[PDB]
Design a protein around this ligand. Structure first.
Ligand SMILES: Nc1ncnc2c1ncn2[C@@H]1O[C@H](COP(=O)(O)OP(=O)(O)OP(O)(O)=S)[C@@H](O)[C@H]1O
Ligand SMILES: Nc1ncnc2c1ncn2[C@@H]1O[C@H](COP(=O)(O)OP(=O)(O)OP(O)(O)=S)[C@@H](O)[C@H]1O
Ligand SMILES: Nc1ncnc2c1ncn2[C@@H]1O[C@H](COP(=O)(O)OP(=O)(O)OP(O)(O)=S)[C@@H](O)[C@H]1O
Ligand SMILES: Nc1ncnc2c1ncn2[C@@H]1O[C@H](COP(=O)(O)OP(=O)(O)OP(O)(O)=S)[C@@H](O)[C@H]1O
Ligand SMILES: Nc1ncnc2c1ncn2[C@@H]1O[C@H](COP(=O)(O)OP(=O)(O)O)[C@@H](O)[C@H]1O
Ligand SMILES: [Mg+2]
Ligand SMILES: [Mg+2]
Ligand SMILES: [Mg+2]
Ligand SMILES: [Mg+2]
Lengths: 319, 330, 426, 332, 327, 33
DNA sequence: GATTCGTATC
DNA sequence: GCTACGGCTATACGG
DNA sequence: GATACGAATCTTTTTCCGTATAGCCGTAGC
């Protein structure tokens, strides 16, 4: 008895105009739609920044009425092997579909980073023979997964993290189109917890409005939780050992985070850290590795994490 | 015939000694039918397999045992496929209908027991498939996981299964059982004997029974008819004699590297084990009141590190020489 | 109305973006392989992606095949997408090679194999290896020339359980062709290098001068030089460079210019870890980029062995012994972490930090080498065979068993000096 | 043919170098029925395998020293098997890591007081021992395993608990010299003095096998004769290790480290175990009189740390090179 | 036949009102289901927090009498590879409703132990069939999940059960079993469970078994400690005092007495000492580092086996050495 | 399905959700021929 | 990426 | 008697 | 004639057994 689409799906962009963030790339996509000479593209970026939606919108605005038989949206959910590339993709590309001037079929190979090597090798061959009628539109979170021979003939349009202003603009549009009572601090908290993920921000706003009504900082933070990569950074950069121990025991242990997650997030933060010496960074990485080994062997306990923090503080503050 | 360890294996739950808590829980749940999933753990040779076999034979009986009990151990394959197919299919199977004799002379609980002995050697990938398997098939099947290290058992499985710990069989726990075995086997021992046997076989009774059997066989072959002395079971086990230990200590006191190396070479020529000499050195150094607190702390840490290195499977000669040099330079 | 890598395609041999020496050696090899004598039967071209490894074969065949053909022009590229009805996919290449051998006189045509069959599958891979092996050892008096352009590329991370290795890491010729084919006297492996900046700039300028009206219309003809220089300096791929230039020219705005990122080679990565990168002076950024772009190369145990065998190249090996001790100690510590990514990060960060505090200007460096482990394992296998034979002959003569450890340590050495030294006397 | 095999004892009474151990073996053989699982631990060259053979002959009468060599196959792990009447040989050396499956199959085939001898049990991996800890306990009515190992340290606690610990001390100098005298009496070499036998014993470090082999080598070199100043024919790898020790204590540089690495690679190619290579390098370094006590203590500490690291590691070259670098830094 | 069940399986909540502790999650999902629309949920937290008893109760309350044909449950006990995800989940989430009852819930318990390829193939199934199918993800380890999968999944964190909820559940179990529990024994159960209902239920079942008369006898703290072989606070405090104050011989004697008279394991004593040492002054920062590092090393060594006497001596020496940085 | 009163085979099948709206429209258009 | 040799050209 | 079909089988692929 | 530039070189390589089924062969029957 629901019949109600999620806010993620409800206000999904259908035009290349309401897609917020990456102004230059969106303008380039608009120019492509205006002209029609779409080159092969490999969109890369973090999850939930409009990569798939941009491809679908440009396909809709290029094919237009011919969208029914002009686009072949393949995905990881569908079977993507050498056989499927050699038959279904080959027949779709080989199909002689009449199109408006300067229009080409768009094979939307979404989640192309999960495709098999042989499938990509067959994609090389099929793209070498069928690129005057079809233009593949890859969409992956990492361009390195697509083989370099494929990237040779495909233009690269890497997407960047959505800023706190474009996300705010789209969130305000959703609020106005939905008539939801908001608070400035609430929207700031939503943006903060989004971490540049527009879909996550939409989901958080929907959960907040559906569970608590008014969207303020208190109601947002009583359902959504502060990002743990930030508490991990706070505890790793703590000058005093007691402060880090408390930050761990109260915000990652009693909060309900596994030790292995705490170790992996610590390693990632140390990899992407700043204002720390290289020797200190490598010593912290070594300590995190020793702790990770201890966790994997089966000794996963708060004591091991406390020992890791003690070692890090010892190597930071010396003897 | 049979080894004394297998000859005196506890057949019923009333023969398992010093594991009072777990055995009394099993005996009380024998009357009822609410036995939960069990996670038996403890030191090696503490009576886990014997206890589970006794409970199995008491609950169902010899005829119903084959049809209502499945046993898997490290001797057989226990991978993810095995857990997914064999264990799941066995648990799904309806419990066999007991015969009239079985119902008359046995409790015949409506559940069945899957015994996964030596579960600490099972990979974490295969331990994740048991989680729901031991939960949805809970009213028709029971699970008994036996291991020596609980750390090798994943947290979900440890939470699902009841935590029964088997105590280490020291000289105040299995002494009654050892005396019973000696009396039944007609073994003559001096006063104080079987206590050194339990101490050397620390946290284990099978080693103690083996030592007792070997000492009895040696005494029988000698033909003197005299009682077994403590030094006999000490040498038979592999304990370094006290004179060799005190010579090692004296060489350590004289901090000459060459003399220590030569005497360590001679000791390794003698063929003794590094673990036994390290344990005896610990017993000598920690107990001796002449040493001060700082020296005792440092030597305790050094012995801990040496034992940790030895357990990894390293060369005994190098570790022993390094330990003795460290003790000398302390 | 089409991609600029087409249309503006090479029409003669001069337009081909290839170095003079590479062109001359390829032409010499082709001319030697078209003679009635068959000293070389196959030409194993190899190199990175888009390094003019395909556009030169057609141009050569334009002025070579017709000259030596009979009277009574192009290539015969193998199509890996043709699914024949009554033909298994493994048998597709078998039929291709068994029907391409009839092109000798009045039908001469070069056989080009660029799109290899699914060599990631073991069965068809070994079937292809056998098929090309039969080609080299064929008793056929006359066979047409054959070229296999194996485009080397770093195979990314995959969910395959084991499926051995080699082809799951790289798509090089050694991972497809076996050692027997590579060392065959009739195989000539002419490797290719990334296109130099000079030829890239020349061809980009040719493309720009062939279409300048839109360039000046979009106020880009005056900014053309910087774009060409950046494109030719960032990538060595001609097709990718042309695509990026087309994308920039057709665009109307301020979109930053981006191109495909090349994968760092094994020796290149070792040099970067040991010496550093001139582009980036930040060790953390360089290490993070190296791990993100190429993690399939830094995860193999060969790279740690590579560092162990090549860190003695800094200042020809005149660095302090303490630095070497620290490097080897940290390498052993990483080996003692059962391949965790943290160990892989630490074993390179420590080396780079150690080789940074001792970086001295005006110090010549030596050359590197692949780790000497394959030779050691082959020698160990030979010693295994020797010990097995000695223990076999030992048990057959007399009933005495000897452990392999003692054979390696005591028996192996004394066995000659005992048995053969008493053979002298007999 | 070989003198070690020529003068190998074939019975418990023929053994005349342990005495007390021989009496204990007689005590064990007095009641062959109740035979516990036996684990012999002692220095290499003691004669533990010969003692096992003699004990099996005592239990199973004559014909134990028979040699029924055959070839088996496991899944293609085609390990060779040395069969004998109530005696089977399993060597963990021929199957490293993958030993669990083959030992399981062999044990279950033998089960069908049959004795299976598994020498050098230290080479058994933690998985094969995990299978054996239950294989021995379960089928302890139709098979009795007897395992001989140099040191029972890498043996898991359950296996040592289920088995019986028997120590085999290395031969003493006087008795091994007596054995050498018996050898030279049976095959006359016309020794100038008996002191050369004592020096050979001192150069064997309690290894009777080494003493017999070097005695035969020296006799062959001196044309079936012996000399007071006859050279000691030590194994080649020991000489290489001594040369490496001299290089380490002489050239303290990075190029010298590369030369040491090349020497270590040659030693590894000679299929010499890495742990024993590290041990011999350490003990040869400690024998240098130039180095002081602090240097030797640092050497032994580094040796302990790096042998632990090698035990907990896959590639052996790293640990050996690290130990060499650490000792080289300590020297200067 | 429910009496012939373990207390961890016959006390499983059947309705959302019996899932204590996770009040915020229960209220939020109740608001979602009352307002019709239910977002794709993802339940995360420590084991035994009620991540399955909540989703099954929610499914029962949504699809009354239709929990069978509307809910598809897949766990780690069954294969969840590429083929399974691409066939079974797709067929279930691609078909129309049985009686137009709503959306088709898909419970994926223990989704952390899933291959990344399956986790990436599931994302498009989740997004392309969200109109008539809502996915629920149960996982104890968040690092095992693809970040995109986390992005397209509303995250609910099942924190460890608070003391009040466990006390209420213990009271319900006592009422249902006609049992008596001392308040000190209840607090010992709270500290032993450390946020886990199954541990409390198992310990209560073992205590009831351990009692000679499960009806007229009360479960005391001594029973709660004897049934699990856990160290009492008194012995832990005595061990800590002996190690911190008395000399090396008397401390070792006290440690041996404590670990022998009750059979207490050394790792349990180490954990107790660690807990008792957290709320300590320890002004010097080096004492904390020494304590944590040495105790972690000893715990790691114990996890691999060894000589218990040597490990206990190591514990004593480590604690003494760490507390020498105090003065 | 029907072939003692023979054998009766009673089967039931669910219908796919039919995501595409034009799919039904194009099927209807095709059925007009 | 570093070294050595090698043409080719302004 | 030959057919059209049920069962057998060699097998390219599967995971 | 000096110098930036570019090529060669610095490299090693291992498996699923089973199975639903398209074509073939024996055969129940009209
Ligand atoms: N720039 C944007 N403007 C408006 N909505 C956006 C934007 N980026 C993402 N969204 C929302 O995100 C949801 C789906 O975004 P997607 O494009 O599917 O995510 P994505 O960028 O493709 O990342 P992945 O790899 O597919 S998880 C929809 O609800 C969109 O409305
Ligand atoms: N509590 C006990 N009472 C009597 N005999 C015992 C007891 N515990 C162990 N034993 C003896 O130990 C032998 C069997 O012990 P097991 O239960 O097989 O060993 P364990 O407890 O499983 O430890 P393992 O084998 O390392 S898993 C028999 O000789 C028993 O008599
Ligand atoms: N001046 C040029 N030089 C080379 N290629 C050119 C040039 N102008 C256009 N091209 C095109 O760029 C492409 C380069 O082709 P090649 O590099 O020879 O093929 P390739 O090396 O096999 O690429 P891979 O390995 O399949 S990614 C072809 O499509 C050419 O038509
Ligand atoms: N809030 C609660 N109130 C009462 N009993 C609970 C509660 N949470 C869990 N339980 C009990 O604990 C048992 C196990 O909890 P489950 O929800 O089935 O598993 P889980 O909590 O999701 O932990 P994992 O991660 O699946 S091992 C249930 O069957 C209940 O008996
Ligand atoms: N009592 C003995 N008298 C003479 N030789 C002996 C005696 N014991 C052992 N040996 C010699 O030892 C050799 C075998 O040693 P081995 O069993 O390999 O030692 P280990 O078991 O330490 O490897 C035989 O060649 C034999 O000549
Ligand atoms: Mg998407
Ligand atoms: Mg057992
Ligand atoms: Mg090409
Ligand atoms: Mg659950």
């Amino acid at each position: 008895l629901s019949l109600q689409l999620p806010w993620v799906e409800k206000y999904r962009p259908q035009v290349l105009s309401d897609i917020v963030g990456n102004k230059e790339t969106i303008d380039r996509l608009q120019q492509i739609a205006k002209d029609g000479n779409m080159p092969h593209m490999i969109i890369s970026g973090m999850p939930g920044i409009g990569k798939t939606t941009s491809v679908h919108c440009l396909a809709h605005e290029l094919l237009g009425r011919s969208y029914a038989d002009g686009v072949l949206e393949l995905n990881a959910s569908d079977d993507r092997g050498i056989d499927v590339v050699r038959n279904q993709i080959k027949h779709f590309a080989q199909k002689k579909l009449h199109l408006p001037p300067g229009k080409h079929k768009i094979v939307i190979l979404d989640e192309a980073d999960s495709m098999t090597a042989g499938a990509q090798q067959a994609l090389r061959r099929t793209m070498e023979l069928y690129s005057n009628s079809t233009r593949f539109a890859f969409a992956c979170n990492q361009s390195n997964k697509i083989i370099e021979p494929l990237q040779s003939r495909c233009a690269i349009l890497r997407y960047s993290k959505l800023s706190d202003e474009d996300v705010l603009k789209r969130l305000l549009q959703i609020i106005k189109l939905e008539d939801v009572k908001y608070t400035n601090d609430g929207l700031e908290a939503i943006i903060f917890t989004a971490e540049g993920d527009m879909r996550q921000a939409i989901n958080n706003l929907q959960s907040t409005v559906a569970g608590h009504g008014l969207v303020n900082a208190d109601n947002v933070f009583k359902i959504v939780d502060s990002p743990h990569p930030l508490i991990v950074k706070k505890m790793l950069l703590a000058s005093n050992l007691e402060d880090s121990i408390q930050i761990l025991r109260t915000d990652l242990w009693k909060k309900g985070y596994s030790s292995i997650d705490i170790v992996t997030t610590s390693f990632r933060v140390t990899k992407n850290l700043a204002q720390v010496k290289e020797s200190v960074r490598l010593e912290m990485i070594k300590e995190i590795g020793l702790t990770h080994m201890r966790i994997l062997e089966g000794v996963g306990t708060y004591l091991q994490l406390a020992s890791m923090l003690a070692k890090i503080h010892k190597l930071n503050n010396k003897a | 015939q049979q080894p004394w360890v297998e000859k005196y294996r506890p057949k019923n739950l009333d023969e398992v000694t010093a594991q009072d808590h777990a055995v009394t829980v099993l005996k009380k749940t024998l009357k009822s039918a609410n036995l939960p999933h069990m996670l038996f753990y403890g030191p090696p040779g503490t009576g886990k397999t014997s206890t589970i076999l006794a409970l199995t034979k008491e609950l169902y009986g010899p005829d119903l045992m084959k049809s209502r009990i499945l046993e898997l151990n490290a001797s057989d394959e226990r991978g993810i496929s095995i857990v997914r197919e064999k264990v799941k299919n066995f648990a799904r199977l309806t419990v066999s209908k007991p015969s009239k004799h079985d119902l008359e002379n046995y409790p015949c609980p409506p559940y069945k027991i899957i015994i996964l002995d030596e579960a600490d050697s099972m990979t974490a990938d295969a331990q994740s498939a048991l989680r729901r398997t031991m939960e949805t098939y809970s009213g028709v099947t029971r699970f008994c996981l036996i291991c020596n290290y609980v750390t090798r058992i994943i947290d979900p499985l440890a939470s699902r299964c009841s935590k029964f710990r088997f105590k280490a069989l020291d000289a105040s726990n299995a002494i009654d059982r050892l005396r019973f075995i000696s009396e039944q086997e007609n073994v003559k021992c001096d006063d104080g004997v079987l206590e050194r046997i339990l101490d050397i076989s620390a946290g284990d009774l099978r080693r103690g029974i083996t030592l007792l059997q070997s000492a009895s066989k040696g005494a029988q072959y000698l033909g003197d008819g005299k009682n077994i002395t403590s030094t006999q079971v000490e040498e038979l086990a592999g304990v370094v004699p006290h004179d060799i230990l005190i010579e090692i200590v004296e060489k350590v006191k004289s901090g000459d590297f060459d003399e220590i190396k030569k005497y360590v070479n001679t000791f390794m020529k003698s063929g003794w084990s590094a673990a036994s000499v390290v344990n005896q050195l610990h017993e000598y150094y920690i107990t001796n009141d002449n040493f001060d607190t700082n020296f005792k702390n440092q030597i305790s840490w050094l012995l801990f590190t040496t034992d940790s290195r030895l357990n990894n499977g390293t060369n005994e000669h190098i570790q022993l020489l390094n330990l003795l040099v460290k003790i000398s330079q302390l | 109305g089409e991609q600029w890598y087409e249309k503006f395609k090479p029409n003669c041999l001069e337009q081909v973006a290839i170095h003079k020496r590479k062109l001359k050696d390829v032409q010499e090899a082709l001319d030697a392989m078209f003679l009635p004598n068959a000293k070389h039967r196959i030409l194993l071209l190899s190199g990175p992606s888009g390094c003019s490894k395909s556009t030169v074969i057609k141009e050569l065949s334009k002025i070579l095949v017709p000259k030596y053909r009979q009277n009574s022009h192009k290539v015969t590229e193998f199509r890996g997408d043709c699914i024949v009805n009554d033909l298994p996919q493994m048998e597709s290449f078998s039929e291709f090679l068994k029907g391409a051998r009839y092109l000798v006189m009045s039908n001469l045509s070069l056989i080009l194999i660029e799109d290899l069959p699914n060599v990631f599958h073991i069965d068809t891979r070994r079937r292809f290896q056998q098929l090309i092996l039969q080609w080299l050892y064929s008793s056929e008096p006359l066979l047409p020339p054959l070229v296999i352009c194996i485009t080397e590329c770093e195979i990314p991370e995959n969910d395959n359980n084991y499926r051995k290795f080699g082809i799951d890491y790289t798509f090089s010729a050694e991972t497809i062709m076996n050692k027997e084919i590579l060392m065959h006297p009739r195989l000539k492996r002419i490797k290719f290098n990334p296109i130099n900046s000079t030829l890239l700039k020349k061809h980009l300028k040719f493309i720009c001068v062939q279409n300048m009206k839109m360039l000046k219309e979009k106020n880009k003809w005056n900014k053309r030089q910087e774009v060409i220089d950046y494109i030719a300096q960032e990538t060595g791929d001609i097709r990718s460079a042309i695509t990026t230039l087309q994308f920039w020219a057709t665009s109307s705005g301020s979109l930053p210019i981006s191109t495909r990122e090349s994968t760092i080679s094994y020796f290149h990565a070792i040099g970067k870890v040991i010496h550093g990168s001139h582009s980036t002076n930040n060790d953390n950024e360089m290490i993070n980029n190296l791990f993100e772009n190429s993690n399939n190369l830094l995860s193999k145990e060969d790279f740690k062995l590579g560092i162990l065998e090549n860190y003695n190249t800094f200042n020809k090996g005149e660095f302090s012994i303490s630095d070497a001790s620290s490097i080897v100690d940290c390498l052993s510590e990483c080996d003692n972490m059962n391949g965790l990514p943290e160990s892989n990060e630490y074993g390179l960060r420590e080396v780079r930090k150690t080789f940074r505090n001792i970086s001295k200007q005006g110090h010549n460096h030596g050359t590197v080498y692949f780790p000497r482990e394959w030779k050691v394992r082959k020698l160990q296998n030979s010693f295994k065979v020797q010990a097995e034979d000695w223990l076999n002959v030992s048990l057959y003569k007399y009933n005495a068993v000897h452990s392999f450890r003692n054979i390696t340590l005591e028996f192996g050495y004394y066995a000659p000096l005992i048995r053969k030294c008493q053979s002298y006397k007999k | 043919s070989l003198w070690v095999d020529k003068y190998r004892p074939k019975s418990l009474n023929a053994l005349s170098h342990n005495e007390e151990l021989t009496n204990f073996l007689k005590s064990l053989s007095d009641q062959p029925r109740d035979l516990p699982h036996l684990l012999l631990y002692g220095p290499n060259g003691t004669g533990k395998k010969t003692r096992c053979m003699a004990l099996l002959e005592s239990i199973f009468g004559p014909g134990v020293y028979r040699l029924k060599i055959d070839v088996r196959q496991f899944v293609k792990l085609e390990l060779n098997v040395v069969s004998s009447p109530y005696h089977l040989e399993i060597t963990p050396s021929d199957m490293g890591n993958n030993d669990r499956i083959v030992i399981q199959e062999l044990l279950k085939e033998v089960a069908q007081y049959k004795c299976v001898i598994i020498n050098e049990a230290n080479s058994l991996t933690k998985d094969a021992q995990a299978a054996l800890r239950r294989t021995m306990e379960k089928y302890s009515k139709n098979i009795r395993l007897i395992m001989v190992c140099d040191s029972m340290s890498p043996i898991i606690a359950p296996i040592k608990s289920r088995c019986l610990l028997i120590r085999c001390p290395a031969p003493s100098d006087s008795e091994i010299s007596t054995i050498l005298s018996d050898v030279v009496t049976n095959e006359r070499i016309q020794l100038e003095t008996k002191d050369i036998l004592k020096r050979i014993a001192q150069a064997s470090n309690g290894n009777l096998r080494v003493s017999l082999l070097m005695l035969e080598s020296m006799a062959l070199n001196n044309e079936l004769a012996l000399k007071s100043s006859s050279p000691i024919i030590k194994p080649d790898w020991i000489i290489v290790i001594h040369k490496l020790t001299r290089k380490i204590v002489k050239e303290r540089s990075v190029n010298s480290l590369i030369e040491c690495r090349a020497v270590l690679y040659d030693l590894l190619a000679h299929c010499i175990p890495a742990n024993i290579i590290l041990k011999e390098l350490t003990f040869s370094l400690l024998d240098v009189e130039t180095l002081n006590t602090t240097n030797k203590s640092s050497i032994i500490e580094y040796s302990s740390v790096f042998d632990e690291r090698l035990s907990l590691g896959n590639k052996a070259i790293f640990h050996l090179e690290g130990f060499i670098a650490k000792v080289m830094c300590c020297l200067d | 036949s429910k009496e012939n069940l373990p207390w961890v399986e016959k006390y499983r909540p059947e309705t959302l009102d019996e899932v204590y502790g996770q009040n915020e999650v229960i209220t939020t999902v109740r608001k979602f289901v009352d307002e019709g629309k239910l977002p794709h949920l993802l339940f995360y937290g420590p084991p035994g927090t009620g991540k399955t008893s909540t989703i099954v109760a929610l499914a029962r309350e949504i699809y009354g009498k239709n929990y069978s044909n509307m809910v598809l449950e897949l766990n780690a006990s069954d294969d969840r590879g590429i083929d399974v995800v691409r066939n079974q989940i797709k067929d279930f989430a691609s078909t129309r409703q049985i009686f137009s009852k709503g959306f088709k819930l898909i419970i994926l318990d223990e989704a952390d132990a899933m291959t990344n390829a399956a986790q990436n193939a599931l994302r498009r199934v989740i997004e392309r069939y969200t109109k008539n199918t809502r996915f629920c993800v149960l996982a104890n380890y968040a690092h095992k999940l693809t970040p995109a999968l986390l992005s397209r999944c509303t995250r609910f964190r099942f924190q460890p059960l608070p003391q009040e909820a466990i006390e209420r559940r213990i009271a319900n179990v006592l009422v249902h079993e006609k049992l008596k529990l001392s308040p000190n024994a209840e607090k010992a159960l709270i500290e032993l469970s450390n946020g886990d209902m199954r541990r409390v239920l198992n310990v209560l079942q073992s205590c009831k078994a351990t009692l000679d008369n499960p009806d007229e006898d009360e479960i005391s703290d001594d029973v709660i400690y004897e049934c699990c072989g856990a160290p009492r606070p008194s012995d832990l405090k005595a061990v800590l005092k002996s190690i911190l104050e008395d000399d090396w011989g008397t401390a070792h004697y006290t440690l041996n007495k404590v670990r022998s008279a009750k059979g207490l394991a050394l790792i349990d004593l180490i954990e107790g000492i660690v807990k008792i040492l957290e709320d300590y002054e320890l002004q010097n920062e080096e004492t904390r580092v020494h304590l944590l590092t040495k105790l972690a090393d000893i715990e790691y060594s114990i996890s691999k086996g060894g000589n218990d006497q040597i490990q206990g001596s190591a514990v004593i020496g480590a604690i003494k050495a760490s507390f020498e940085n105090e003065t | 399905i029907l072939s003692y009163p023979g054998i009766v085979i009673e089967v039931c099948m669910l219908e796919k959700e039919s995501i595409d709206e034009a799919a039904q429209t194009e099927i209807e258009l095709l059925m007009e021929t």
